[PDB]
């Protein structure tokens, strides 16, 4: 990644085994459960495009997902190139060239060029731009592997209300890949006895009040 | 988080895998037992609002609680906006804008803006302000999931006094979410033989003396 | 905690997950065995009162002990206030105020005030003062939960002398909470055959010589 | 490895136990699965040729592979020598000599000479050059130990489409040692019912659309 | 411990959880096997007397040994006082006082005084002096708990020679607490067939040659 | 070890628990398998003779090997003394003395003297010189405990060729203690069917081609 030293200047630092192992284990344990995405984002703080490819490459399984991610990346890179065409022809000696989609994705750029872009003034944050493309793809994957529709999350006749609400909002989080946009459907899919207590609370009950009322 | 360097200046530093993993495991092992809250506070030392959202987002389960936390956060942010309205209209070029509730909660502010607020002179400590809102919500959650009333903590006929006092004050801590405001109820809920020894100690016995007397 | 930087100046540093986890696990594994106390003291090197409360708060169980510790802390703070009354009335603008017991225990002081006291010249070491109060309380707890009197530590008819001496001095350490003030009682509680060998050594035998003689 | 200090200058640093252990465990757990290669590359960030030999040498098993790697290294070093012959005869006192293949592979050069090359201006990046040779060899090994042809990856009659796509692209990755150059063969090797749905999608369906259509 | 900073000056640093845990686990796993002593010495690199007491205090069991260690420490401190008597009477304002045995053992000195001695010019290395006393005691303990005499280490009729030599020199190391001062007794305690081969080698065979000859 | 600081100067640093534990576990898990040697060399990067003795001393078992290592060390030290005799008589006040074999092995030199030699200009690298002696001894040990001759490594009638080549080169590595100096013996010890395929390849087949041909 790029971090600041005591100069205090922005410099490249090797990705640590600590970070590498964290990401590998998160994927191993959690697959594409939505809470994997914020972990990816935090572990890749300050990442160059090279670092981002490294993390993605250390994933052993899930190659269907990874191919879908590649397809999303290529789509975003094509759109980058539409929005910001780069001038062909030889570039000026010693000068910084403009990055195209493939440079941002780190397929056609060197680490040194990536470093140059990220630390220039003003900087071209190719690491942040590539990370956004990756998260866009990962969100699609989280939504694809979400196994259940919110419409099938209904409270069991013997299920405690809190356990039902946990399933409901966990399902909501995956179906929406942790992006916000509920109250009524939650009451509707409650079991008969809880639904009765809830309807009699009136509209605008907080979740706290609902869980209290059905405890 | 924000830490000081050797300049020695306040600078942003990436959240470490060590911290990320600690928080994830604490929640996994302890749920919303009250001692989870001080762990959250210590692990989030120097946190930006982005860092705080990261930690909250890496929690996989407990989505009922998390939605309750969101509702508490939105309440505190609405109140912030009532107390400190921000001036609409274009802000002055190159100047720091005023944060509203959603900026403090990190929903509508960038990391760079958060950094600017936290390191300004005088600083606007948006990380500390957001952490207070979060702890307020987490305390509500700790109190909700407290499974037992202090009124049902009574010493078993064969239960050692120390084991009874452990249950009593552990229950007290959850019911009050580790916030202070006892002696008499502790004696009242003691078993017959211990209660006898305790009553004969008179008022104002220290807990030490009570546990000694019933050992 | 407070540590020195390369300026090299005394600055506040966040408590590390490494330290937090160490303390939590020590208590989990060892309860209030006496060797827990020196571990507490070493893990809390350079601690502010805030850090000390953090460590104490991350303890999940043992709430009878923790309440006894609170009572000891309040006693020491009352005595601090007797010895060093603070002047009421508004304090001088921009000036350091005097800490009372509750400030030292970190109940009524901010981290910034604690930092100010600890780094002032001359410093008021509120972290060290609070740590002493805590260790005073923890020592009482170690002594309370000591399950056996030294008078009941007697060598088994088939127990090796070394195993008996281990139990004897381990019991002594708890009963005295690792504070020093023996030879004769150790011989007295030895089994018949070992006691015979020991009596014939005469007074002033070193433990080494005693263990050699009964090996 | 070589890293920059606060001068901020390029200096040699000892390889850490953290890195050494990471590499050893990766090989132990994963053999020559393709995701091992990017892990090698990241763990060897900034590596001297000495560091690269160290990592390769700490591998205990897989000695057939290691001998194949040696043969690849010797081939690349022979080619280096063809392209960049070094002048025989005594070199100038105090001056940097030219590296030949065996110096780059660290068989005939000292750590001090390697350091000199890597930090000279302009530098001769012998660590990066040697790493490329090693990855070239490791890629051959990954391809050799790939147990299955893509032609034998066909969807089971009861196999979920996603599970089939995972096997297909994982096989592709090994057979090609994680180097890119598919859609049609993936449809062809699908089972009858999925193939029907897929053919009726028309050409140019994204993988996302295909997996959606066969879910 | 005391380490140098970038000033680069000798400063006090808190003992790390890493070090604390290492020592605790070494004792837990290895007891007073001789290889425990060099581990103690290395883990206590740069230790103040306070740090040394900390490490000794975190040992939970083995209290017979610890009392023997205390007795050895008191003996060395008495001898220090004989060799270097300290002048009674009030010491000069602001000046460094002379350490007596109890100051070196850290029973009657503060951390600040210990720091002063260790960093003075010329320094009085109270940490190194105390460590020597401790190792002297630990060596006595290693020798006491050595369960077997070298005279009872004889090669089994079916025991491989290498396995016999391992037991022989491991026994030697404990009986001598890893202090050097053999060839003949090793041959004498060999089994009949190996002894025959060995006698016919003549005097002055290296161990290598002996183990080769009896393989 | 000796490392450079930010001055940036060569200074002594305590050996870390991380390093100490790594070495101890490597020996525990791997004995004197050849890949242990490069691990020793890397873990002892920058080591003083004191550090080298520390690492060797933390090994609990294998005392036959350790005594053989001592004998090798004494041989190398005797030869050092033959090549570089040191002048007897009192050395000049404040001046650096010449190291003899026992100083390099750290038996008769202090840490301060070792530091002086290693950081002098020009330096006398006593750590590197001692490490070479140790590796020379360890290599002898690896060769001694090699359980099998390359002449007994023959392909099983049902053994896959790759599994045979793994055993062959692993045996070669131990018998030669990871020092290079094969093709023909590998074919000769192949099973009948593989030998046939191999002979018909002609001389000069690469191992890659051989393993391909017998897959
Ligand atoms: C955890 C989560 N569960 C969801 C369910 C449906 C849709 C989205 C989600 C999310 C992501 C989610 O909303 N995470 C929160 C952080 C958070 C997590 C947990 C509790 C409180 C705050 C977040 O990133 N931001 C920016 C946020 C902060 C405060 C209020 C609203 C949003
Ligand atoms: C641990 C705890 N148990 C409780 C039971 C009921 C109500 C609250 C609690 C708490 C939180 C609790 O009170 N924690 C203590 C720290 C502490 C923890 C454990 C022992 C001693 C001191 C705390 O944060 N402060 C500021 C404090 C310090 C000294 C005296 C009183 C309060
Ligand atoms: C370990 C311990 N066991 C005891 C039994 C009864 C009473 C007290 C104790 C103690 C605490 C105990 O005495 N710990 C020792 C350190 C120590 C620990 C173990 C062996 C040697 C030195 C200590 O803190 N100090 C200041 C000390 C140092 C040297 C001599 C005497 C005291
Ligand atoms: C993971 C992988 N699976 C493959 C299957 C067949 C052939 C090659 C591969 C690879 C290596 C592979 O292609 N890894 C990717 C990084 C990556 C990994 C996973 C998902 C998305 C991006 C990579 O290194 N680069 C430079 C890249 C980046 C974006 C688009 C295309 C290539
Ligand atoms: C390991 C050990 N085994 C022994 C058996 C009997 C007596 C003493 C011992 C020792 C302690 C032991 O001798 N350790 C060695 C270091 C060492 C350890 C292992 C192999 C080679 C060198 C040591 O500390 N020094 C100073 C030393 C160095 C070279 C030659 C002779 C001595
Ligand atoms: C791993 C190893 N196996 C052997 C079998 C017989 C004899 C020696 C060995 C060795 C030690 C061995 O040769 N290790 C290699 C490093 C290495 C390890 C593994 C694969 C490729 C390169 C080494 O140290 N050097 C200097 C080297 C580098 C390139 C070519 C030839 C030698």
Pocket of ligand 1 (CB under 6 A): A 169, 172-173, 176, 178, 180; B 53, 56-57, 63, 66, 69-70, 73, 105-107
Contact indicator for C141, C68 with CB cutoff of 8 Å: yes
**Residues pairing with E10 in the sheet:** E4
- Residue whose CA is closest, atom 14 of ligand 4? A57
Is F77 found in the same domain as F46? yes
The closest CB to that of F68, out of E18, E30, E207, belongs to E207
Q: In angstroms, what CA-CA distances link B57 with A33, B13, F101?
A: 12, 19, 61
**Distance between CA atoms of residues A167 and E126, nearest Å:** 63
Q: Cα dist. C153→A76, C142, C189, F171 in Å? A: 77, 18, 7, 58
Is the preceding peptide bond at E76 cis, omega within 30 degrees of 0?
no
Q: Cα separation of C110 and C56, whole Å? A: 18
Q: Which residues of D touch F41 (CB under 8 A)?
A: 54
Tell me, yes or no, whether E199 and E108 share the same domain. Answer: no
Residues C160 and C187 in one domain: yes
What is d(CA C36, CA B53) in angstroms, rounded to the nearest whole number?
35
Q: HSE-up of F153 (CA within 13 Å, CB side)?
A: 23
Residues in CB range of E84: below 8 A, 6 or more apart: E98, E100
Return the bridge partners of A11, or none.
A3
Give all chains having 3 or more CB-to-CB distances under 8 Å with chain F.
D, E
Q: How far apart (Å, rounded) are the C-alpha atoms in residues D209 and D151?
A: 23
Measure E41 CA to nearest chain F CA, in Å: 9
3 state SS of D53: helix
Inter-residue contact C43 to C18 (CB < 8 Å): no
Question: Would you call B41 and C59 a contact, using CB atoms and an 8 Å cutoff?
Answer: no
CA separation for the pair A12, F121 (Å, rounded) = 33
Q: Are C26 and C138 in contact (CB under 8 A)?
A: no
Q: What is the CATH number of the domain that holds F92?
A: 1.10.375.10
Contacting residues of F for D11, CB less than 8 Å apart: 4, 8
Token pair of D90, please?
Answer: 């005594």
Q: How many helices (H) and strands (E) does chain A have?
A: 11, 2
A residues 6-35 closer than 8 Å to B (CB): 6, 8, 18-19, 21-22, 30, 33, 35
The residues lining ligand 4, judged by C-beta closer than 6 Å to any ligand atom, are A 53, 56-57, 63, 66, 69-70, 73, 105-107; D 169, 172-173, 176, 178, 180
Task: Please answer whether residues E32 and E65 qualify as being in contact, where contact means their C-beta atoms are separated by less than 8 angstroms.
Answer: yes
Question: What distances in angstroms separate CA D99 from CA B210, C158, D88, D108, E186, one per listed residue?
Answer: 82, 74, 12, 9, 52
F139 and F174 co-located in one domain: no
> Do E187 and E174 share a structural domain?
yes
Chain B within 8 Å of C111 (Cβ-Cβ)? Answer: no
Cis peptide bond upstream of B122, omega within 30? yes
Q: Does A108 touch chain D (CB under 8 A)?
A: no
User: Residue C187 class from Cβ within 10 Å (0-12 exposed, 13-18 middle, 19+ buried)?
Assistant: middle
Number of domains present in the structure of chain E: 2
Identify the domain containing residue E93 by its residue range. 1-149
CA-wise closest residue to B47 among B14, B83, B86: B14
Q: Residues A21, A26, A32, A36: is their CA dihedral positive or negative?
A: negative
Distance from CA of C186 to the nearest CA of B (A): 27
Nearest CA among A66, D46, A158, E35 for reference residue F53: E35
F77 CB-near residues (< 8 Å, 6+ apart): F100, F101, F102, F104, F105, F133
- Scanning C142-171 for CB atoms below 8 A from E yields 162, 165-166, 168-170
Q: Alpha helices, DSSP H only, in chain B?
A: 17-30, 36-43, 49-57, 63-83, 101-104, 111-119, 126-145, 161-175, 183-188, 192-199, 207-213
Residue D24 per-residue DSSP state: H
DSSP string across B132-145: HHHHHHHHHHHHHH
Using an 8 Å CB-CB cutoff, list chain E residues near F58: 35, 38-39, 42
**CATH assignment at residue D167:** 1.10.1200.30
Give the integer Cα–Cα distance in Å for B103 and B106: 5
Angle at B27 between CA B26 and CA B31, to 5 degrees: 120
Kindly provide the resolution of this structure in angstroms, with one decimal.
2.0
Distance of CA F154 to the CA centre of its chain: 28
Q: Checking phi first, is residue E177 left (phi over 0); if not, alpha (psi -120 to 50) or beta? A: left
Q: Which domain-ending residue is among B149, B174, B204?
A: B149
Helices (H), chain E: 17-30, 36-43, 49-57, 63-83, 101-104, 111-119, 126-145, 161-175, 183-188, 192-199, 207-213
Answer yes or no: do D35 and A67 touch at CB < 8 A: no
The partner residues of C3 in beta bridges, in order of sequence, read C11
CB atoms within 10 A of CB E89: 4
Select from A144, A150, A143, A151 the least CA-distant residue to A174. A143
Give the Å distance between the CA of F24 and the centre of ligand 2: 42
Check E63 against C178: CB less than 8 A apart. no
CA F58 to chain centre: 17
- CB of B172 closer than 6 angstroms to any ligand 2 atom: yes
Statement to judge: residues A109 and A67 lie in one domain:
yes
CA distances D176 to A148, D28, D170, D171, F85, Å, are 36, 22, 10, 8, 61
| Whether residue F122 sits in one domain with residue F170 | no
Q: Is the dihedral of CA A115, A118, A124, A129 positive or negative?
A: positive
H-run or E-run covering C5: none
> How many of the other CB atoms lie within 10 Å of CB of A176?
16
Question: Considering CB atoms only, which of F8, F19, F33 is closest to D17?
Answer: F19
Residue F61 · residue F29 · CB < 8 Å: no
Whose CA is closest to B175, among B202, B150, B208?
Answer: B150
Q: Are E12 and E111 in contact (CB under 8 A)?
A: yes
| C53 and C110 housed in the same domain | yes
Domain-terminating residue out of E107, E122, E149: E149
The two structure tokens encoding residue B146: 């407290």
State the distance from the centre of ligand 1 to the C-alpha of F180, rounded, in angstroms.
60
Residues of C in contact with B162 (CB under 8 A): 64, 145
- Contact criterion met (CB < 8 Å) for B63 and A3: no
Contact between residue F3 and residue F14 where contact means Cβ atoms under 8 Å apart: no
First to last CA, chain D: 48
User: C110-117 long-range contacts, Cβ below 8 Å, gap at least 24?
Assistant: C111/C12, C111/C48, C111/C50, C114/C48, C114/C49, C114/C50, C115/C2, C115/C12, C115/C48
Residue E54 in contact with residue E111, Cβ under 8 Å? no
**Closest ligand to residue E134's CA:** 3
Side-chain half-sphere of D134: how many Cα atoms within 13 Å?
27
Query: C191 CB less than 6 Å from ligand 3?
Result: no
DSSP bridge partners of F12 = F2
Question: Cα distance from C193 to chain B (closest Cα, Å)?
Answer: 36
Pocket of ligand 5 (CB under 6 A): E 169, 172-173, 176, 178, 180; F 53, 56-57, 63, 66, 69-70, 73, 105-107
Provide the shortest C-alpha distance from residue F66 to chain E (in Å). Answer: 9
Same domain, D90 and D46: yes
Please list the residues that pair with A12 across neighbouring strands: A2
Verify that D111 and D140 share a domain, yes or no.
Answer: yes
Cross-strand pairs, B11:
B3
- In angstroms, rounded to a whole number, what is the distance separating the alpha carbons of residues E13 and E46? 10
User: Which residue puts its alpha carbon closest to atom 21 of ligand 1?
Assistant: B70
Distance CA E2, CA E23 (A): 18
Ligand nearest to the CA of D76: 6
Q: Is D183 on the interface with A (CB under 8 A)?
A: no
| Distance, CA of C109 to CA of D26 (rounded, Å) | 50
The number of angstroms, rounded, from the C-alpha of B18 to the middle of its chain's C-alpha atoms is 20
| E-chain residues near F27 (CB < 8 A) | none
Are the beta carbons of F144 and E30 separated by less than 8 Å?
no
Tell me the CA distances in angstroms from E60 to C92, C169, E15, one per residue in order: 51, 11, 18
Strand partners, F3: F11
Residues D128 and D37 placed together within one structural domain of the fold: yes
What is the pairing mode between strands E10-12 and C10-12?
A: unpaired
Select from E122, E149, E176 the last residue of a domain.
E149
Interchain proximity A11–D6, CB inside 8 Å: no
Residues D142 and D154 in one domain: no
Among E111, E96, E99, residue whose Cα is nearest residue E53: E111
Q: Are B36 and B59 in contact (CB under 8 A)?
A: no
CA D52 to centroid of ligand 6, rounded, Å: 11
Distance E178 CA to ligand 5 centre (A): 7
| CA proximity to B10, closest of A4, A43, A10, C116 | A4
The two three-digit tokens of residue B204, written as one number: 């104002």
CA B30 to chain centre: 14
Cα gap A190→A212, rounded to integer Å: 14
- Among residues D41, D107, D43, D46, the alpha carbon closest in space to that of D73 is found at D107
CB of C172 within 6 A of ligand 3: the answer is: yes
Give the H/E segment covering residue D210: helix D207-213
**Cβ–Cβ < 8 Å for B166, B155:** no
Q: For residue D78, give the ligand nearest its CA.
A: 6
């Amino acid at each position: 990644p790029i971090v600041q030293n005591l100069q205090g200047q922005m410099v490249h630092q090797c990705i640590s085994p600590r970070t590498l192992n964290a990401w590998v284990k998160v994927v191993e344990e959690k697959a594409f459960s939505p809470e994997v995405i914020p972990m990816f984002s935090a572990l890749s703080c300050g990442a160059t495009p090279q670092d981002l490819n490294t993390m993605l490459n250390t994933v052993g399984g899930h190659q269907a997902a990874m191919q879908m991610l590649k397809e999303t990346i290529n789509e975003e890179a094509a759109e980058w190139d539409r929005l910001h065409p780069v001038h062909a022809g030889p570039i000026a000696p010693g000068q910084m060239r403009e990055p195209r989609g493939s440079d941002i994705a780190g397929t056609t750029s060197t680490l040194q060029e990536q470093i140059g872009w990220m630390t220039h003034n003003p900087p071209i944050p190719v690491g942040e731009i590539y990370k956004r493309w990756i998260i866009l793809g990962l969100n699609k994957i989280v939504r694809m592997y979400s196994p259940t529709s919110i419409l099938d999350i209904r409270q069991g006749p013997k299920e405690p209300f809190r356990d039902y609400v946990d399933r409901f909002y966990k399902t909501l989080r995956a179906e929406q890949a942790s992006q916000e946009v509920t109250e009524t459907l939650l009451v509707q899919n409650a079991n008969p006895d809880c639904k009765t207590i809830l309807k009699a609370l009136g509209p605008g009950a907080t979740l706290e009040e609902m869980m209290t009322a059905c405890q």
